[PDB]
Write a protein that binds this ligand. Structure first.
Ligand SMILES: O=C(O)c1ccccc1Nc1ccc(OCCCCCP(=O)(O)O)cc1C(=O)O
Ligand SMILES: O=C(O)c1ccccc1Nc1ccc(OCCCCCP(=O)(O)O)cc1C(=O)O
Lengths: 331, 335
């Protein structure tokens, strides 16, 4: 195993042999990888087009180096709501208010919204565990939990272009949720992620908006990879089938203060395209959550998930869970 | 112009816009490119498959950053003999000595790893400044440009090469950035599509060059099989198939063609008159460079040019002129 061997293989457009991706990630996590080698690998793998086995090794090794949460502090039915690259933050809160444990994993952009809302996002494992137990939701700040990734994070900024590493966020949640709604901006890489979750024995909905969104929207149809029990089902999803009005991407589009205001409005009951998108993804995460204890029918599962997501807002539960989340950090 | 744009375009398998490659390389040549950005650029363009225009822009920038030789020290008809590397430093090194001994000025360009290593094993002083390389050309008829000495600004790229350790588009720059700027030569490449790219760059320069690709992976004309030759001259490129058998050369084996000291011994044997596959390959490539040299001042017929090139190359060995030139080369550095 060497960088010449692995990189040479990728630049010949060949899939890696077993363990090679894992070796590369280990060199990164130990700090032995040079920036040039990280970049070469990220770019070469991306242009080659990564496989689930390769992504599974990258995410697997990285996750094993992450700060774990304390033993028995994360429910077995905890879920994630996230995309690879607004709505996922809101959806996470709603799902939590519906009675589903949610544990997110994120970073500040070049998480910011949660800070603008007064949430203390940068907490250690013990307090994230307490947050999950007392508020019903927790947030793992990525730099806090993945410090060994910092050189790769720097590389990713310096090159600026999306690479295979942009798939690692949803696959390296330190709390190791077994369920969730996972959004991917590219159909090619969406199926790859579904394969990784499949091997993990996760129950997730890997979603890809046919408009290029990394989450279920009301702008157009979406492709969903239904992952459960090690199997993947590819489906098409039309929100219109659930009486949702179509919208434009302009409405689902700002700064932290603006995003924070959007959150309070939606949680405050404000109707519109933004709310609809939040309810869709929240429902998706709930349907994924149900996929742990059962394998119910697609339509009626979504009917139930949409009902719970909607009620979580309209009860004031979501708005009040947020308030409790802010009060938690203050005390 | 920025890295996210250029790298974005490349990873999308799109050719760059005019000027972008040059911008990228200059950022690299000025220490303004992060190692990650250098590696990302080199790898991305490699897998995209570089164009002659892109490589030409890279080579143009790198060459403009290089130290020149003094004015009026490099003859107009100086040649280079080199391969971009196999997947053959013994062959090219010997061919260069033979060509010089034939009366054709030769100026080489290489580094330690290796091209320069074999010469050091032979006792040649490789790391000389412009004025001494100039003296070597005039007094010995051959000169060597030590790549780190003449391309100091390439140090950031050179470090990245080592760290990734895989061939990239950058490996094409050597023959295209010879700081003596020979207008002719024999240039080898282990891959056909990259050979065609380099031929395109030499064409744009109006150079007289044979770009060669052994159909067995050799970055030089081989005896083991046929070769493709891009005959570059007068801004145009003829793509030709080449069979040494047509000149009476026996079909050798690749195994018949590793340390610098081992290569150094092979040089002394061949230049000493030892016959075999290696001699044949040396004479072929040397003859090729002489054909290229002829293309500077005339459009000669292909076969007669080669026959004359083979005649002179063989003579340069048989008379002992090649062996003696090496000796003078060594002595020159000792003094
Ligand atoms: O930059 C640092 O120097 C640093 C220092 C201490 C700890 C962490 C540090 N950097 C990071 C480490 C992990 C990370 O994120 C881990 C990858 C998962 C993030 C999810 P994303 O792909 O959506 O951003 C990001 C950074 C960073 O600089 O931003
Ligand atoms: O190797 C160095 O030590 C070096 C130091 C400072 C600046 C540049 C350095 N290396 C190079 C200089 C020019 C170059 O390109 C032109 C010469 C190409 C020589 C190819 P060869 O090794 O097969 O002869 C390549 C390198 C390099 O190490 O990659």
């Amino acid at each position: 195993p060497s960088w010449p061997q692995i990189l040479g293989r990728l630049t010949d457009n060949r899939d890696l042999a077993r363990g090679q991706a894992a070796w590369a990630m280990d060199q990164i996590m130990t700090g032995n990888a040079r920036p040039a080698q990280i970049a070469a690998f990220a770019v070469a793998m991306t242009m080659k087009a990564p496989t689930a086995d390769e992504v599974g090794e990258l995410a697997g090794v990285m996750l094993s180096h992450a700060h774990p949460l304390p033993a028995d502090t994360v429910p077995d039915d905890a879920v994630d709501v996230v995309g690879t690259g607004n709505l996922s933050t809101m959806a996470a809160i709603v799902v939590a208010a519906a009675g589903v444990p949610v544990v997110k994993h994120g970073n500040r952009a070049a998480a910011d919204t949660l800070e603008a809302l007064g949430v203390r996002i940068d907490l250690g494992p013990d307090l994230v565990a307490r947050s999950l137990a007392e508020v019903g939701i927790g947030f793992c700040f990525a730099p806090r939990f993945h410090p060994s990734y910092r050189h790769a994070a720097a590389v990713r900024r310096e090159i600026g272009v999306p690479t295979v590493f942009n798939l690692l966020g949803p696959l390296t949640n330190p709390a190791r949720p077994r369920a969730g709604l996972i959004g991917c901006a590219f159909a090619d890489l969406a199926e790859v992620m579904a394969g990784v979750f499949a091997a993990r024995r996760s129950s997730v909905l890997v979603v890809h908006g046919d408009d290029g969104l990394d989450e279920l929207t009301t702008t157009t149809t979406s492709t969903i990879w239904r992952v459960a029990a090690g199997s993947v089902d590819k489906l098409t999803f039309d929100p219109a089938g659930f009486g949702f009005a179509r919208a434009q991407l302009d409405q689902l589009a700002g700064d932290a203060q603006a995003n924070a205001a959007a959150v309070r409005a939606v949680l405050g009951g404000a109707r519109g395209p933004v709310r609809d998108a939040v309810v869709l993804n929240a429902a998706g995460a709930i349907v994924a959550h149900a996929g742990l204890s059962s394998r119910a029918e697609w339509l009626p599962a979504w009917e139930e998930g949409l009902r719970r997501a909607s009620a979580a807002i309209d009860t004031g539960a979501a708005e009040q869970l947020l308030a409790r989340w802010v009060r938690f950090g203050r005390q």
